[PDB]
XYZ file of C-alpha atoms in Angstrom:
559
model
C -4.699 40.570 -13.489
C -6.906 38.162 -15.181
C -6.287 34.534 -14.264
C -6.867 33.373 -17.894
C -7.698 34.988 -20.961
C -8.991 33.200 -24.402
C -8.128 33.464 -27.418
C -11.728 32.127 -28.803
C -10.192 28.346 -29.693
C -11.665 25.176 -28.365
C -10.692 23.195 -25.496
C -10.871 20.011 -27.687
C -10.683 16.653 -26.515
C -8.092 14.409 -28.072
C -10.002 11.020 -28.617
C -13.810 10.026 -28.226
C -15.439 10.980 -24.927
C -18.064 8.853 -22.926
C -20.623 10.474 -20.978
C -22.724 7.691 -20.183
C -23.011 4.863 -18.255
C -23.711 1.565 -19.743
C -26.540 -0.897 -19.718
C -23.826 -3.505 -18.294
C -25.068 -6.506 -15.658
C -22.198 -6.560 -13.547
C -22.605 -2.856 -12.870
C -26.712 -3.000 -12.816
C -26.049 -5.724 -9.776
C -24.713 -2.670 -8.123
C -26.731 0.377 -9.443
C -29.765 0.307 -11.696
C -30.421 4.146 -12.217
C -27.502 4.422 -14.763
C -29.207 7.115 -15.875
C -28.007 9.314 -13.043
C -24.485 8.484 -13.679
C -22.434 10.683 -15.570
C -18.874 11.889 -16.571
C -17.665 15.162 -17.826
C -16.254 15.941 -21.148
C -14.676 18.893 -22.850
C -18.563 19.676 -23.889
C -18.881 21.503 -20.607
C -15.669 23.123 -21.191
C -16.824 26.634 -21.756
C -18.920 26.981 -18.730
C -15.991 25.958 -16.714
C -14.339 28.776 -18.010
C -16.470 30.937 -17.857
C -16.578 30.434 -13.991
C -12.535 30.258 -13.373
C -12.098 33.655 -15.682
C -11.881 36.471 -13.288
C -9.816 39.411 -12.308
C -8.231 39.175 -9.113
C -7.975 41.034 -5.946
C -5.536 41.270 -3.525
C -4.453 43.243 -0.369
C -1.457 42.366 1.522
C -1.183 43.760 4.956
C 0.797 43.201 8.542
C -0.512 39.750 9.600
C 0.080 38.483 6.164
C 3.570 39.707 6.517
C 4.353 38.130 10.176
C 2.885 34.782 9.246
C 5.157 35.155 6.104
C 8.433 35.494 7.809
C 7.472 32.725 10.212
C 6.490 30.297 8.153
C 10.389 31.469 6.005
C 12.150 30.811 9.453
C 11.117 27.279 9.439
C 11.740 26.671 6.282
C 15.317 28.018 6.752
C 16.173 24.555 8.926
C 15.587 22.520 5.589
C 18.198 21.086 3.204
C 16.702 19.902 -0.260
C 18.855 17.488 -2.406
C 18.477 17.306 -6.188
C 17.261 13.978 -7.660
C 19.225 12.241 -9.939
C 17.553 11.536 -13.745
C 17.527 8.300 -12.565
C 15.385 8.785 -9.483
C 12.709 11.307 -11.309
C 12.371 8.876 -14.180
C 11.033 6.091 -11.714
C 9.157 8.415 -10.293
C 7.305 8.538 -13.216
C 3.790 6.539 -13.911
C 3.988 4.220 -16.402
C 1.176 5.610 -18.415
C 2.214 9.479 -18.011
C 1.458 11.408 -20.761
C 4.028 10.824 -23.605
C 6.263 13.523 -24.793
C 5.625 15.502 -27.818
C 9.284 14.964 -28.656
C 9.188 10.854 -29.456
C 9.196 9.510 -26.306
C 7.025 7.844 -23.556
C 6.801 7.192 -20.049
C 8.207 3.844 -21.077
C 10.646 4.904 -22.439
C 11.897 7.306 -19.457
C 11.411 4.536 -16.713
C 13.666 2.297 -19.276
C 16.057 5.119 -19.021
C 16.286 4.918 -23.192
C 19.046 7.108 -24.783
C 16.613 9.257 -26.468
C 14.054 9.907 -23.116
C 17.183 10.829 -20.986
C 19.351 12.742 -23.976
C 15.850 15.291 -24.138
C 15.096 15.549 -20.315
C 19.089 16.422 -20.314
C 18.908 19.713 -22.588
C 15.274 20.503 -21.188
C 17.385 20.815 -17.834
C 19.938 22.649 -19.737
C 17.633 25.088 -21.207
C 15.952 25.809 -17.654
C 19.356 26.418 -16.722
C 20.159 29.033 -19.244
C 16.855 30.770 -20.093
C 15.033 32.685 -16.816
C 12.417 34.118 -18.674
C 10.435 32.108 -21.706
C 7.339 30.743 -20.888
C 6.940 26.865 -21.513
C 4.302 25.459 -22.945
C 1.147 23.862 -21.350
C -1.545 21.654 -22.312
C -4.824 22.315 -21.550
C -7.575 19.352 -21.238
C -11.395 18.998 -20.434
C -11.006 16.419 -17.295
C -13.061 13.341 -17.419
C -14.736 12.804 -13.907
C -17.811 10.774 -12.561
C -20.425 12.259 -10.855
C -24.150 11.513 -9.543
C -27.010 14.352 -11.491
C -27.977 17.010 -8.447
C -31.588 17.255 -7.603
C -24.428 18.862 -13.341
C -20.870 19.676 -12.828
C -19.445 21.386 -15.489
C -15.664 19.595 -16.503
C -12.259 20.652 -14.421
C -9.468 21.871 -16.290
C -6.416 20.262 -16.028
C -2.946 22.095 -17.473
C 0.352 20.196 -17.570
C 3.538 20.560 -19.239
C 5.514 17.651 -21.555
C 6.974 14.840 -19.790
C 10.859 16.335 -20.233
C 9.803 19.186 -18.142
C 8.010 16.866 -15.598
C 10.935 14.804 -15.067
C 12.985 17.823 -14.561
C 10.526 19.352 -11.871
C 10.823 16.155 -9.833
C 14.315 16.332 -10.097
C 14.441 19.960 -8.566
C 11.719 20.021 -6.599
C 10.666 16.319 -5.736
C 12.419 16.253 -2.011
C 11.369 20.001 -1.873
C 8.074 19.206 -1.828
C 8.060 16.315 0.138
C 9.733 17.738 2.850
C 9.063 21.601 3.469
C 5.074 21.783 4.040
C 5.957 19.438 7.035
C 8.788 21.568 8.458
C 7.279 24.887 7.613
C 3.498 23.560 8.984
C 4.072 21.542 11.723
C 0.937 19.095 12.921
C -1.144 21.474 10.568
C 0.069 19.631 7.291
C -2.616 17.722 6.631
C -1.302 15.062 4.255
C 1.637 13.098 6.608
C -1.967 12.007 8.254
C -3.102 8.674 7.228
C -7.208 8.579 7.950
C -6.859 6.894 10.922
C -4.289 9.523 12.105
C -6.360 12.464 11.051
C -9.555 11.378 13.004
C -7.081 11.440 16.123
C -5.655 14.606 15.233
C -9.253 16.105 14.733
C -10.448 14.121 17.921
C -7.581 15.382 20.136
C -8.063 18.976 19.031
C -11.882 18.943 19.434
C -10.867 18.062 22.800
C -8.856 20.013 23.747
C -10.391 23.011 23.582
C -12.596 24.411 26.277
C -16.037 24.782 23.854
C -14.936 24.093 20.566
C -16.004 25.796 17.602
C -15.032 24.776 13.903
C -15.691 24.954 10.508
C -14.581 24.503 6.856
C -13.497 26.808 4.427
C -14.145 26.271 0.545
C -12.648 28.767 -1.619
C -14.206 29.487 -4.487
C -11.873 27.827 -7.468
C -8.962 28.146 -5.204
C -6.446 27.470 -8.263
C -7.697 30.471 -10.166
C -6.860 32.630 -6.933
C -3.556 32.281 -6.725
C -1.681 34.761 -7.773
C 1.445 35.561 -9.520
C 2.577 37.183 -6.060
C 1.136 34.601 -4.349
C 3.918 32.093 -6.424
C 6.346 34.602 -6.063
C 6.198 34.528 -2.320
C 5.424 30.619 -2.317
C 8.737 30.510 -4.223
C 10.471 32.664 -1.702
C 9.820 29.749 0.852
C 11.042 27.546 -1.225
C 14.447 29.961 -1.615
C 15.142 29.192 1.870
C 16.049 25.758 1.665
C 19.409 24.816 1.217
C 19.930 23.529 -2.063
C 22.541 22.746 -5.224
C 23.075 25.808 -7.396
C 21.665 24.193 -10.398
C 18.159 23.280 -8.227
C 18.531 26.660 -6.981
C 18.343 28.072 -10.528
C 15.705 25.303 -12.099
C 13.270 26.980 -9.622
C 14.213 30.686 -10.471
C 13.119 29.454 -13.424
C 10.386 27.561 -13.614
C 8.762 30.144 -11.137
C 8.769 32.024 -14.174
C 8.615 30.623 -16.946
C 5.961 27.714 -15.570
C 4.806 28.538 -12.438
C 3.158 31.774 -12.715
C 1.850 31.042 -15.869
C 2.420 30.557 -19.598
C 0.607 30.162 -22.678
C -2.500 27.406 -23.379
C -2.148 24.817 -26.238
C -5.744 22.436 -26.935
C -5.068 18.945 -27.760
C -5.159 19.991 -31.654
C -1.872 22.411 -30.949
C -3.716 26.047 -30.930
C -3.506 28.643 -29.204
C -5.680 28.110 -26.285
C -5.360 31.463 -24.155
C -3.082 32.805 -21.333
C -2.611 31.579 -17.503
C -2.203 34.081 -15.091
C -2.936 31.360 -12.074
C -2.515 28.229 -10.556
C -1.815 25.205 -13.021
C -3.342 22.145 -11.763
C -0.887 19.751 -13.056
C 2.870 20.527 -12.003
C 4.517 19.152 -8.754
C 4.429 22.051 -6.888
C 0.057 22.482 -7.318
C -0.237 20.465 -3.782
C 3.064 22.267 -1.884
C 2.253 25.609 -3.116
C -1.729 25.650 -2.659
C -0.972 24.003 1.036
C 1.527 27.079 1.883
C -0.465 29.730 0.351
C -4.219 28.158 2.095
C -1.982 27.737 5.417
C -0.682 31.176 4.720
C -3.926 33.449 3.822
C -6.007 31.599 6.721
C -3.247 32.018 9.725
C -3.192 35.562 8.790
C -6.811 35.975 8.547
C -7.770 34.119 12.253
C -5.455 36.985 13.872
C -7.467 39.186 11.983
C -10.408 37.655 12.545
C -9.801 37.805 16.336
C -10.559 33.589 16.387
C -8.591 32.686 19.539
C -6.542 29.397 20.255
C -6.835 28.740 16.608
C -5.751 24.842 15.383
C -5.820 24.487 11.553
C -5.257 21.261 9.299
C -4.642 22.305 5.510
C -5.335 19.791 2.336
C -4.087 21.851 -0.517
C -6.697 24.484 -1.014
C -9.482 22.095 1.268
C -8.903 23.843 5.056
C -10.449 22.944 8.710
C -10.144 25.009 11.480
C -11.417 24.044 14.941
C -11.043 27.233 18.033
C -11.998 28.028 21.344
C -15.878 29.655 20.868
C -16.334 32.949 22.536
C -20.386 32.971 22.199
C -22.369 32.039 19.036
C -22.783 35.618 18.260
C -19.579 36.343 18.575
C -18.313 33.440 16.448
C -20.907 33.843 13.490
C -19.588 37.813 13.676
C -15.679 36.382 13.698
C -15.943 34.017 11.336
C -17.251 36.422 9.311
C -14.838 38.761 9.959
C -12.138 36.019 8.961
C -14.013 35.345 5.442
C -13.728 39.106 4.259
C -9.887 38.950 5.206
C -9.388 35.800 3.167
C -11.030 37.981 0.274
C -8.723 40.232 0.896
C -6.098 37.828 0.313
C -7.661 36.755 -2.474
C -9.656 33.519 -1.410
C -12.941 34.571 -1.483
C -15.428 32.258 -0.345
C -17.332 29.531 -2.688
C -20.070 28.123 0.461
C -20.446 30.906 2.761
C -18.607 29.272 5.768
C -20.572 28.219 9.111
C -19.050 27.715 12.528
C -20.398 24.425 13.740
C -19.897 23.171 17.722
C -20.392 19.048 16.583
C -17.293 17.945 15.266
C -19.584 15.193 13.006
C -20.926 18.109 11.288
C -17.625 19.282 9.689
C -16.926 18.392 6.445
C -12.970 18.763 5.735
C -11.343 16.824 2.556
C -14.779 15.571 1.657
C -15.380 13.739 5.052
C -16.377 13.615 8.426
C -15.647 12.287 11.633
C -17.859 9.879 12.824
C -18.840 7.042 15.624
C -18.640 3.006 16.033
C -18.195 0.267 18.267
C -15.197 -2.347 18.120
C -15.790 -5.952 19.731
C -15.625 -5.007 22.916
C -17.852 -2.238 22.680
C -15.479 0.275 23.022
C -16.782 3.522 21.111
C -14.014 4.065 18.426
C -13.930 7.692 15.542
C -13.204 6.439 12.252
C -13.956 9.132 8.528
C -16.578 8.576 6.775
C -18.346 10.290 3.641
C -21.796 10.858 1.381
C -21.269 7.564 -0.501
C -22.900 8.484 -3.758
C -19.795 9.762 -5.554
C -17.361 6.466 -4.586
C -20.774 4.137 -5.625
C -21.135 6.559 -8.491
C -17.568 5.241 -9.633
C -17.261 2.294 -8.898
C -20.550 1.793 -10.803
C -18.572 2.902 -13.774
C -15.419 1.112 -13.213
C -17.114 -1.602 -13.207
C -18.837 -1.507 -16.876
C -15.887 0.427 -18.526
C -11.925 -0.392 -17.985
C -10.750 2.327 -15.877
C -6.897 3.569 -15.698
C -7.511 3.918 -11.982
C -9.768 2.207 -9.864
C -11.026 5.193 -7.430
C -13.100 2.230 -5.801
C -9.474 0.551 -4.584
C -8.769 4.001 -3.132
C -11.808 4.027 -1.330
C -11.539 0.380 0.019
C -8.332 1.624 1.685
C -8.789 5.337 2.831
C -13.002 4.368 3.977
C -12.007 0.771 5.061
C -14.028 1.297 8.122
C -17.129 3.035 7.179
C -20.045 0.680 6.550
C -21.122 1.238 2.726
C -16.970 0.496 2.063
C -17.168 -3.029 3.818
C -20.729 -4.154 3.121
C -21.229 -2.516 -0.393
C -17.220 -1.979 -2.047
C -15.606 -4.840 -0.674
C -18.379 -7.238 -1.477
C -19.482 -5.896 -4.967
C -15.663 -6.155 -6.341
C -14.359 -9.621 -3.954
C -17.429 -11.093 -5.905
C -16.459 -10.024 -9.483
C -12.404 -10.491 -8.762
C -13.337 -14.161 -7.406
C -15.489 -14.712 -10.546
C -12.733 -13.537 -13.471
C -9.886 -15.002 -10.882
C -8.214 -11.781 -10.969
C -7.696 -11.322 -6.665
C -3.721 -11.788 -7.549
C -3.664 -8.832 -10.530
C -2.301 -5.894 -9.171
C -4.470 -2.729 -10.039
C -3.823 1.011 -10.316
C -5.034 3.597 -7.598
C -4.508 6.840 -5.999
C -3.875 8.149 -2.504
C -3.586 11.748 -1.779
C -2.365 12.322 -5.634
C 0.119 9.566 -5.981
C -0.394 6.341 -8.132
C 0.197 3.299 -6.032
C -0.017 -0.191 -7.961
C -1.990 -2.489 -5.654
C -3.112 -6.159 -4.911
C -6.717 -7.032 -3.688
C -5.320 -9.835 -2.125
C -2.871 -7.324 -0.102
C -6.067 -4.985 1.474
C -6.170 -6.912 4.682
C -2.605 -6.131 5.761
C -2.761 -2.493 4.364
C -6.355 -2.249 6.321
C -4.483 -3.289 9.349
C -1.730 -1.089 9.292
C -3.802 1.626 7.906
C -6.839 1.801 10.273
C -6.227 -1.034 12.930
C -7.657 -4.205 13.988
C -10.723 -2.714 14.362
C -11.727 -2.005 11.109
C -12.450 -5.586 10.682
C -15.007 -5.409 13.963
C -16.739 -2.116 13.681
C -20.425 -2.010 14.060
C -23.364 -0.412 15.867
C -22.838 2.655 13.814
C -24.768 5.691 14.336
C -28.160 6.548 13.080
C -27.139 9.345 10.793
C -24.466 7.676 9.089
C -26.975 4.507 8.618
C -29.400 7.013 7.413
C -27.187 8.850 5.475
C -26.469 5.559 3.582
C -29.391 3.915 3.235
C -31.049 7.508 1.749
C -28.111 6.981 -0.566
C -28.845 3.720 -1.808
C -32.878 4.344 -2.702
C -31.267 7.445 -4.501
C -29.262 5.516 -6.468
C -30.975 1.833 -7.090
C -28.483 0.660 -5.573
C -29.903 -2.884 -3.497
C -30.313 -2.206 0.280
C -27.658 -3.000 2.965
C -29.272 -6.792 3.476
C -28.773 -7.737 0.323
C -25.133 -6.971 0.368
C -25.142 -8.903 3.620
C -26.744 -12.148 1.798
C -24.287 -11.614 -1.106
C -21.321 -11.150 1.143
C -22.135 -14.427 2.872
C -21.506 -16.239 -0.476
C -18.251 -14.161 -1.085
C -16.866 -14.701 2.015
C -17.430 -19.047 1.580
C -15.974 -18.780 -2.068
C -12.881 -17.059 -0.335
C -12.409 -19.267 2.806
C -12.460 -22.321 -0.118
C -9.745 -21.420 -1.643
C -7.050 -20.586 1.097
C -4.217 -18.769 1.083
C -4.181 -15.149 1.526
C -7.396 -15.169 -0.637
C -8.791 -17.053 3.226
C -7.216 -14.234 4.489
C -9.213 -11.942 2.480
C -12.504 -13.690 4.012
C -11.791 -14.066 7.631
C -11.111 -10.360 8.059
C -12.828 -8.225 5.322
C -15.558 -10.476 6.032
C -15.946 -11.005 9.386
C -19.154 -8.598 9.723
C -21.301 -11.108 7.509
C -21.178 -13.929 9.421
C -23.256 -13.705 12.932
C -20.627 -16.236 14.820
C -17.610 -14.149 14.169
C -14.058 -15.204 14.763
C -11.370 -13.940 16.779
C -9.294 -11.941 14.908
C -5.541 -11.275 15.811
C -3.119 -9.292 14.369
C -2.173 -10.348 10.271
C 1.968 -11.906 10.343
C 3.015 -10.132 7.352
C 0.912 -7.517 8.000
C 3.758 -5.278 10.437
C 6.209 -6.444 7.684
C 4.950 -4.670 4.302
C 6.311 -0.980 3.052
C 4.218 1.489 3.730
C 6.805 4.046 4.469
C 6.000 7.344 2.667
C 2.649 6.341 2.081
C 1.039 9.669 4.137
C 3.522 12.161 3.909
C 2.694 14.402 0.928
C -0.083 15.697 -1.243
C 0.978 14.895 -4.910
C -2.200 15.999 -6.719
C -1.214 16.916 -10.075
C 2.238 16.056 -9.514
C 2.433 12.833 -12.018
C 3.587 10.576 -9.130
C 3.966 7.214 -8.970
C 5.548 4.723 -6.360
C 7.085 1.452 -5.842
């Protein structure tokens, strides 16, 4: 069938959009080609469609089937618990998207009479009616991006905030709990980056000659399905769970799930979804299972022996045991037409790579350093000209979330995150006073409020002493940064090192866990270092459930 099919209406956008960045001095400290610098809008809207409108194909055979059944016999060991209204409402992000029925996110996380008395019959009425298809919204997203030697917008579908709450409430500990069980080591997102690099490290080395590569499918979401969420649901049918859960995902497998009618922010009649929607709790489970799924079959298929996969949603790695480059180049491609088959066609032609550094998996790469002692030590790293990009524009317009927090913490150790990130915003939190504000991010799909003055201890416990001590990095990951930079006008690494200097005294002055902030996010810039032990508080904060779930779309939030 046709993943999505238009009525001829707008996808309109529901306030003014900016495009642009601005002529603003704190962010022209940071990057002076703002012309380069863009964000989507709903303007790009139709070429967006254009690409994700497309009838599918689909061929089901014996491998699919086996892996099927396997991945159903794990699942089988799980026991899912309903959440309480309580629990889903503070699950809920403050600034969700309000109801179209006179209520916010406020007002559900207040537990208000009115919030809880409409998530109540929205429960009711997913208990009584199987078959009528809710209603979705359908937006233009706003993202930042660097022009290409551009990007047309995302679209983003959700339903109200009643049926949001009642998804967590069925599905919440469903999907928080079954990719692991069902996926083993292979689920990429109970990984926190330092854990992944060690997971990709060990694997790499474990194989005789390893041989690897990334898969992108092309606009994975608009390739699922309705079988595919029929079968994803079957997984989920295995789990032992309350009668009314039980039912809320018969359900919403039906009447959400698979697909449902398009609404523009004006209220018309959009079009029809025949696909994955990108915004409903089970977009990170579901594309996880069905990626894991499709590509297990395929490598039996595809002949790829002693095959170790690590799955991201719809982004997939998979590092084997090469047989001869001939013979890989001929089995990978082998393993492409049976994910077409599948339907999960290819977007980049994949390439089987034997460096490990080469791989790009969940937009990064492994990569080399050198802790005090000179010990050689992997830590991710990326193309920097997205997160500068961003935080170039977080910095001259308010932001909801700060993408550049995110990046502090997953990239901590990568040099454009400690010379560049950490000493552009430090600077500009020191100079409004705001290092004690807590500020909005996301990891792996889930809002997390933070404090800057918290980042050493979550560094710590994140990616290790060493994080703090890295250096000596490798030429291609200098070069890759530095080409960056030029690219962007954004001031060469020994600038940052003169401004950091100045950051790092302004910090030390004050004391406190600001000090804190300057001894160890700091200690690169000055050239007699200090000894740096282990942070008290540090083994002492929450991180628990940090890294165990994708949430991407999910409207997740998390105190």
């Amino acid at each position: 069938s046709m993943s999505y099919t238009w009525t001829g209406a707008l996808i309109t956008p529901c306030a003014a959009e900016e495009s642009k960045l601005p002529i603003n001095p704190l962010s022209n400290s940071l990057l002076r080609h703002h012309n380069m610098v863009y964000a989507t809008t709903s303007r790009s809207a139709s070429l967006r469609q254009k690409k994700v409108t497309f009838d599918r194909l689909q061929v089901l055979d014996d491998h699919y089937r086996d892996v099927l059944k396997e991945m159903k016999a794990k699942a089988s060991t799980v026991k899912a618990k309903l959440l309480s209204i309580e629990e889903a409402c503070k699950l809920t992000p403050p600034h969700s998207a309000k109801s179209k029925f006179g209520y916010g996110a406020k007002d559900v996380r207040n537990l208000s009479s009115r919030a809880v008395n409409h998530i109540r019959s929205v429960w009711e009425d997913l208990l009584e009616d199987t078959e009528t298809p809710i209603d979705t919204t359908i937006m233009a997203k706003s993202e930042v991006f660097c022009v290409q030697p551009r990007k047309p917008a995302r679209l983003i579908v959700f339903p109200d905030l009643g049926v949001r709450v009642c998804e967590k409430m069925a599905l919440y500990d469903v999907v928080s709990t079954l990719p692991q069980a069902v996926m083993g080591s292979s689920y990429g997102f109970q990984y926190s980056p330092k854990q992944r690099v060690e997971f990709l490290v060990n694997t790499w080395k474990s194989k005789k000659c390893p041989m690897g590569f990334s898969y992108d499918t092309r606009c994975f979401d608009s390739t699922v399905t309705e079988s595919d969420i029929r079968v994803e649901e079957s997984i989920y049918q295995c789990c032992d769970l309350a009668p009314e859960a039980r039912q809320a995902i018969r359900s919403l497998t039906e009447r959400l799930y698979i697909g449902g009618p398009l609404t523009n922010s004006k209220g018309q009649n959009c079009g029809y979804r025949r696909c994955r929607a990108s915004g409903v709790l089970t977009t990170s489970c579901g594309n996880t299972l069905t990626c894991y799924l499709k590509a297990t079959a395929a490598c039996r298929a595809a002949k790829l022996q002693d095959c170790t996969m690590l799955v991201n949603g719809d982004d997939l790695v998979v590092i084997c045991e090469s047989a001869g480059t001939q013979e890989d180049a001929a089995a990978l491609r082998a393993f492409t037409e049976a994910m077409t088959r599948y339907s999960a066609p290819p977007g980049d032609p994949p390439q089987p790579e034997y460096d490990l550094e080469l791989i790009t998996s969940c937009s990064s790469n492994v990569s080399v350093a050198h802790d005090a002692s000179g010990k050689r030590v992997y830590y991710l790293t990326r193309d920097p000209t997205t997160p500068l990009a961003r935080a170039a524009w977080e910095t001259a317009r308010h932001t909801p979330i700060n993408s550049w927090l995110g990046n502090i913490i997953m990239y901590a150790p990568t040099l454009w995150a400690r010379m560049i990130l950490m000493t552009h915003f430090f600077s500009i939190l020191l100079a409004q006073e705001q290092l004690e504000k807590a500020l909005d991010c996301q990891i792996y799909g889930a809002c997390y409020s933070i404090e800057p003055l918290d980042l050493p201890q979550i560094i710590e416990r994140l990616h290790g002493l060493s994080a703090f001590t890295l250096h000596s990095y490798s030429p291609g990951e200098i070069n890759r940064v530095a080409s960056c930079l030029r690219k962007l006008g954004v001031p060469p690494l020994r600038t940052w090192r003169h401004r950091a200097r100045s950051v790092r005294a302004k910090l030390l002055s004050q004391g406190g866990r600001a000090a804190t902030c300057g001894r160890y996010l700091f200690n690169w810039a000055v050239r007699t270092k200090l000894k740096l032990t282990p942070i008290p508080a540090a083994s002492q904060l929450d991180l628990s459930g940090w890294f165990v779930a994708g949430y991407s779309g999910g409207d997740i939030y998390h105190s």
